Amino acid sequence: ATKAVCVLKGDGPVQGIINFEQKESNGPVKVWGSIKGLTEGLHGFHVHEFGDNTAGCTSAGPHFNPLSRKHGGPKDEERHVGDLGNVTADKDAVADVSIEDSVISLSGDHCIIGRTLVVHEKADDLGKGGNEESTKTGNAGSRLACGVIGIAQ
Amino acid sequence: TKAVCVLKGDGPVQGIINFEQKESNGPVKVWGSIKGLTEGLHGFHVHEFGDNTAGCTSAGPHFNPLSRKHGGPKDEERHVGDLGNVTADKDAVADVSIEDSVISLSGDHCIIGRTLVVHEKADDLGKGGNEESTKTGNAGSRLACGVIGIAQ
Ligand SMILES: *[Se]c1ccccc1C(=O)Nc1ccccc1
Numbered sequence A: 001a002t003k004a005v006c007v008l009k010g011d012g013p014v015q016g017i018i019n020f021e022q023k024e025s026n027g028p029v030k031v032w033g034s035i036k037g038l039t040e041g042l043h044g045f046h047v048h049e050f051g052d053n054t055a056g057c058t059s060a061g062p063h064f065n066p067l068s069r070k071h072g073g074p075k076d077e078e079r080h081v082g083d084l085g086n087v088t089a090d091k092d093a094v095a096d097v098s099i100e101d102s103v104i105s106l107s108g109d110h111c112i113i114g115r116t117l118v119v120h121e122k123a124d125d126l127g128k129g130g131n132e133e134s135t136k137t138g139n140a141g142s143r144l145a146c147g148v149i150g151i152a153q
Numbered sequence B: 001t002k003a004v005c006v007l008k009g010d011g012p013v014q015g016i017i018n019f020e021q022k023e024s025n026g027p028v029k030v031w032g033s034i035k036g037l038t039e040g041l042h043g044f045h046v047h048e049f050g051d052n053t054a055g056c057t058s059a060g061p062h063f064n065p066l067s068r069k070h071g072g073p074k075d076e077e078r079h080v081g082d083l084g085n086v087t088a089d090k091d092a093v094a095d096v097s098i099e100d101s102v103i104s105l106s107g108d109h110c111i112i113g114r115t116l117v118v119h120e121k122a123d124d125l126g127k128g129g130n131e132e133s134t135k136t137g138n139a140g141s142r143l144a145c146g147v148i149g150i151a152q
């Protein structure tokens, strides 16, 4: 198995720990952990292209999109590799994250190690929104917290 | 290929370190700045895990894919992660300028997704007079660290 990990940090504190595990290179990636300090509701949850936090989460650039597709939800064929949809915070300000994804990888061209995981201000409309930005960012708004995805023990 | 690392920790130490590799079989240029350091040498290493779960301790040992002993960057007998020391002046600033032929941004020596750490004390480059010299270089605690990420 390959394992990766990401510490999310941002103002609030929006603070999170996200684990990734992939049993085989041809297999799905399990994504799990917790994020605290979130407003109740949906928050867009993406892998961004650069593992660059030089000037904060903005330095990470756009959604990780190695196949040059449009933005979508994780269940869509038409999606960025980085498109992991939304995490949900309850009134406790905590998102318990539990995702399985077949498009991200911890090996190959779709590998997310060394990239940036970001949790966003607003809901990702999964590219079903009523404007042009829907097909690029999903209108998930500002970057609340982020971290670089690293190799784990 | 380009990579970058933001060094942060619990205390005054913070830095930005850039990596550039023109060809996969070529050296990696390492440059940037670290502030908040005491005057003198500070061990400067790539550690095995890009894991900052509980701060710099979670990064584990020096990145050592070839199972060698600790050394300096100009030694054959070194960990891949062994980048020696950075030097802070009385200004508390280390200006970093390294070229290294053993680290890579491609292949089995790749350091992307691992942790860069700047240490409390000098790395003795494995020439110290104790057992720990051949493992850690006696560079002491981890002042600041970050995960090495892919850059634009
Ligand atoms: Se995984 C991983 C993590 C960081 C940087 C590169 C990779 C990787 O697997 N790279 C690679 C292999 C094959 C094709 C493109 C990229």
Ligand SMILES: *[Se]c1ccccc1C(=O)Nc1ccccc1
Residues within 6 Å of the ligand: A108, A113, A114, B105, B106, B107, B108, B110, B111, B112, B113
């Ligand atoms: Se580079 C890098 C950084 C972290 C993890 C993996 C790699 C990498 O490119 N490894 C590798 C992948 C594919 C082919 C050769 C080597």
Ligand SMILES: [Zn+2]
Residues within 6 Å of the ligand: A046, A063, A070, A071, A072, A079, A080, A082, A083, A136, A137, A138
């Ligand atoms: Zn997207």
Ligand SMILES: [Zn+2]
Residues within 6 Å of the ligand: B045, B062, B069, B070, B071, B078, B079, B081, B082, B135, B136, B137
């Ligand atoms: Zn070492």
